[model samples]
Target chain A: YPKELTQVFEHYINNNLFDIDSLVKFIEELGYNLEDLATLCLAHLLGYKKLEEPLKREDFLSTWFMQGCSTISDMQECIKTLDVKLHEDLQYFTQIYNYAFNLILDPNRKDIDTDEGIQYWKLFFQPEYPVRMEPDLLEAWFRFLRDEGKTTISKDTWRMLLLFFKRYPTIQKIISDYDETAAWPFIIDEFYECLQDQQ
Target chain B: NKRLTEDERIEKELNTERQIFLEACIVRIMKAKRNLPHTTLVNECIAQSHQRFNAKVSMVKRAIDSLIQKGYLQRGDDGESYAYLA
Candidate 1:
């Protein structure tokens, strides 16, 4: 580690990224010089992708606070692999987990209804939180549940998802939203909410 | 064990007061690296560092420059913009 190296942490959670406790030793290994390096990587992770305008300003901040790097492309080049890996893994898990978890739980998991299933599915897609989004390739399965025969979806798959959702509330929020709406009005309600918030 | 101990020593040394982002934060293209024939454009950094949005080239240059001065990186010349040496 260089004597002059700078480090910066995004203030999120580094313990979850690697070996939980490894963060305690990052300063030691990298040296106490580069806090800025840490900030660059941290900002890249937080959503500091690319700026729409170079010198643009608002209220008192020039950069968008709490929002930077929205896409994988915006991440620091060195840590970009984590973005790619998570994107692929999340997509795969969303389906396989949804399929297997629900297959086991659908009929048995009384707390989650059919409406919860569709809501969870949409949450794992674009813009809202893209790491959860998969390509439209799974639409065939989505269509299967919505069309053909609803009974085809196995019970265990729903259980698996229900179990997983209990741990990660973000996905469970999808189900709760559905419980309120009777069904998703189709992915746009949140869009309207975001528009209202942005304004 | 030696590496870990030394690393530990290095880690504590970095937390001292430093001018964090006291320089240009806007994004601007400083220059690109000149390949033998093909060159890459430099990323703009500057106040854009604070902006945290995207697509602006020049602002990134200025923001990155502040980091450069902070000893986070070493610059390489490909005959164009400053490149962070890995």
Candidate 2:
């Protein structure tokens, strides 16, 4: 298994590193978009922390071997399987969602700009994405921040926003029962007030 | 006056409550400082309101202006600062 995985990794290796160029080429050959959720899922599964960093040969070989993939076909099939799981499995989707923060956040910065955060939110909260949020409610959230001149999203807000949607599944539920006294972030509290004002 | 739907009534009441809250916050700051610049007053109101809710700058500004009209505060000669009205 190690030997076969080594051969597969070697196909993408450059001077002993499986770098971004090779990673992009490999993903392209598999007909996957670099921005695809499954691509991010694959990176998470392989324990890749930064988007631009190269994967060490040993790290790549061991990760695939641990996933029980021994060949290129095995790896491709595994990623395809994860893509389906991301749609159907809530737990798997949650795992990917959390890992995505580490992957997308700048190592030098503690928080992300609100616009950048919204871009990921659009991708992750798609109707076809794993989690389900009311379309209008999502738009309301975006509009609230946009109008409020919110400039950045902290890590806490990023994680809590998902849980907020999970807890309140509908716009009416949020509007009627949101407790400002609760542990929601300030932006979320402001969003609740914004929604209330709109009604 | 025109009739309001139950939701509209609730929204109106919430807006009143928020306005009162902001007004009270401004009064509290003015009572202590007695005089402050517009920017400092806004920042102080935001910091004080942070524990309860995130105050919107527009709302804070509106509340400050409301207080000025109500004789609780007056703009300074420079027009950039506010002096508490005793």
Candidate 3:
């Protein structure tokens, strides 16, 4: 790192304590919005347990900064590298995608019911997601559920639906492999069956 | 229901439901147990209410505070335990 760039980094790390407000300001100083996927990618690089916690300065330098993330375009490139990795491996993509939902899960409620699923789905459709999702996919899912005369969706099926659509993005394989009493739920089987017909 | 905005309406409904659950749990437990310490009362209130909704500690404290203010609970000879005053 250049002496000037190192001094700027040291100043924030000394004052901000790596907390959410500080990290956001730091990201903004680097010329990126907190809403940017690159910001989340940076958060992941920092290995923060909670969103509010601060990133350790030593690790930030030795690890992420070592990866050449000093400038705005450099951070964008870092995010693009992650995007490339995610696209290359479906299983890895599914893991990261599902991990994102853990932050939104109710702390008091161990089991997720229909009402929670609907509430979570409403939040998931917002711009707050790690990456933007197709609104029509959720709409189609809602219509399909309504057609089936159901109001609620379970957590497993809800998350699996997201992974199936966004992460994996295949209808034929899903339709062919789906089983009621097996890995996937009956609702998923029906959803895939409908999608196969549509295709 | 129709007059309130969606955010205000949901907040109102959830707060009302929470109060209902909190009061029911505290009153039912106080009546059933008669005299119990603060910790035991809070625990029983939580257990009784978990089936409906999770009774938060702050809400339980609020309910107990109200009960005591209303003369429904009196301090026992033990000083810590609360005696049901029906």
Candidate 4:
């Protein structure tokens, strides 16, 4: 390998210290500098999103993000199972997404709002109330909020939405972070690797 | 007459009616990947690409907003930059 690219290769190797240790090593042997390939910084982001309050947020997603599986499918599978377990006591996934969606979308004009959004709207997009969610889950979640006199989405609801959020972060960050086009792949792949890990 | 008040009704909603909704979204996402790669931006982008599926950037963005608020996802940078994750 040439001297200029060597640092990235080394950095990539170092980054893989946890789950995909073999990944960087395996790719390096193939004569590719893994770091030059793409950096998976968002694994933490992926892990971070799966969190919920009672059980999901009860802990930190970064704990799982650090594992850095070599593929996205694996990580997603793990999260899917995690979703199942969180709902085990509740015994259901609670289709909270649609309920949340409508909460934000309908006649309300998607005028949804949130404490976090108010806290950092400039940094991120603003929220809509009656938050759009799965018809059943959203309905159920609202039922929870209505019953409890709270509008904050439940931890299980948050955890599930985290899965849904994966769609935009790369594109959002690509623009939001003002990053190099090449760098986007690494962050994107890293997120996938984590998802891939579970499979 | 009804015994469950606001909170009880909400709890009942998710535990029962809501489960179907959550299950549907999960099923849809799982199928979205039938043809796409697991973790590439192309994969992620394409999944969101289908406006035809009644899904697209705007709707997906709305979906994410809800998740982030729950603390299921965190807003952070790569040190060099911030990325969102689920």
Whole-model Cα lDDT of every candidate shown, in order: 0.33, 0.80, 0.60, 0.34
DockQ list for all candidates: 0.01, 0.03, 0.02, 0.02
Better of 1 and 3 by lDDT: 3
On TM-score, the stronger of 3 and 4 is 3
Q: TM-score of the candidate numbered 1?
A: 0.19
Candidate 2, B1-86: lDDT as tens digits: 77998899999997777778999999999899998987788889899998888888767766765676577887664545778888
Alpha-carbon RMSD to native, per candidate: 27.0, 13.7, 14.5, 21.6
Estimate, for each residue in A19-99, the C-alpha lDDT of model 2 and write its tens digit: 888888778777797877888988988889897799887778788888888888898999999999998888888788878
Q: Model 4 reaches what TM-score against the true structure? A: 0.18
Q: Alpha-carbon error at B50 in model 4, in Å?
A: 5.2
1 or 4, greater by DockQ: 4
Poorest stretch of ten by lDDT in candidate 1 chain A: A51-60
How is the predicted docking of candidate 3 categorized under the CAPRI scheme?
A: incorrect
Docking class of 4: incorrect
Q: Per model, state how many residue pairs clash.
A: 83, 0, 2, 64
Those runs of model 1 whose alpha carbons end farther than 4 Å from true positions after fitting are A1-112, A125-136, A151-155, A158-199, B1-86
Q: Is the docking of candidate 2 incorrect, acceptable, medium or high quality?
A: incorrect
lDDT value, residue A3 of candidate 3: 56
lDDT of 3 by residue, B1-86 (tens): 37789899899898778877787677777788888986788788888888888877666665664566567776554434678878
Give the per-prediction TM-score of chain B. Answer: 0.32, 0.88, 0.74, 0.35
| TM-scores (chain A) of the candidates | 0.23, 0.93, 0.55, 0.20
- Between candidates 1 and 2, the one scoring higher on TM-score is 2
Which portions of model 2 show Cα errors greater than 4 Å?
Answer: B1-86
